[PDB]
């Protein structure tokens, strides 16, 4: 009875390991042969996220470059609009 | 016999492109309704209070929530808050009494042999 997980269903179940083609876990039951479970058909694994990208993933991500051109511009800073400036 | 209550209601509407529409010909018709459930919001709760105060050795019951947590599209965590305080605990008193009895016993045993003076 291949299953994607393992659980203790009997009163005397024991988590063992079978020497199959590959090391595979399993559950053996003495009072019921039907409860014999073998974890050999799991779900496909996903592609994990690298650790080094953690800093730039979680938390408030502020803009890299700030905005200053809109707050920097002035008539005095332009030769075409400087003469029109009047302090009187 | 038990009572339950819901804390989230489906009111946000969402549209979907009908099968047979071009790239862009305006917004599609309403498809279904969803509820914007942010993190930390409660979904279901049972006001029922654990009556078994002098029995802290038993964990709560969450079979009902276990039966539906796989269904939900979000990870859920069980919770159970009560009015039970530390000060009002019998564990402390039991501990105290055990300590006292131990001490008493020890004292008695030392005094019996007479290896040391009394008082």
């Amino acid at each position: 009875w291949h299953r994607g997980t393992l659980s203790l269903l009997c009163s005397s179940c024991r988590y063992v390991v079978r020497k199959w083609h590959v090391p595979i876990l399993g559950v053996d039951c003495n009072a019921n042969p039907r409860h014999k479970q073998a974890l050999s058909v799991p779900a496909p694994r996903s592609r994990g996220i690298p650790k080094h990208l953690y800093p730039f993933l979680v938390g408030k991500q502020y803009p890299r470059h700030p905005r200053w051109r809109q707050a920097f511009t002035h008539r005095s800073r332009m030769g075409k609009y400087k003469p029109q400036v009047a302090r009187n | 016999s038990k009572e339950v209550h819901q804390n989230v209601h489906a009111t946000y509407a969402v549209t979907r492109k009908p099968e047979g529409t071009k790239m862009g010909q305006g917004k599609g018709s309403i498809d279904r309704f969803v509820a914007r459930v942010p993190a930390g919001r409660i979904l279901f709760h049972i006001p029922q209070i654990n009556p078994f105060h002098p029995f802290p050795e038993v964990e709560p019951n969450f079979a009902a929530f276990k039966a539906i947590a796989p269904r939900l599209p979000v990870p859920v965590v069980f919770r159970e808050q009560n009015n039970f305080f530390q000060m009002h605990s019998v564990k402390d008193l039991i501990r105290k009494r055990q300590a006292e009895e131990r001490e008493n016993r020890e004292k008695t045993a030392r005094d019996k042999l007479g290896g040391f003076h009394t008082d």
Binding site: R47, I49, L57 | -
Partner: protein, 35 residues
């Protein structure tokens, strides 16, 4: 699923976390923030 094209290869060390033509950067953040 999003796994064939080159706009989804993670940044490795010394790239700035935003190389040319990336989508997964903004996908994961969005996902976490709400899907």
């Amino acid at each position: 699923w999003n796994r064939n094209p080159s706009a989804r290869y993670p940044k490795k060390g010394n790239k700035g976390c935003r190389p040319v033509c990336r989508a997964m950067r903004k996908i994961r953040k969005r996902l976490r923030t709400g899907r």
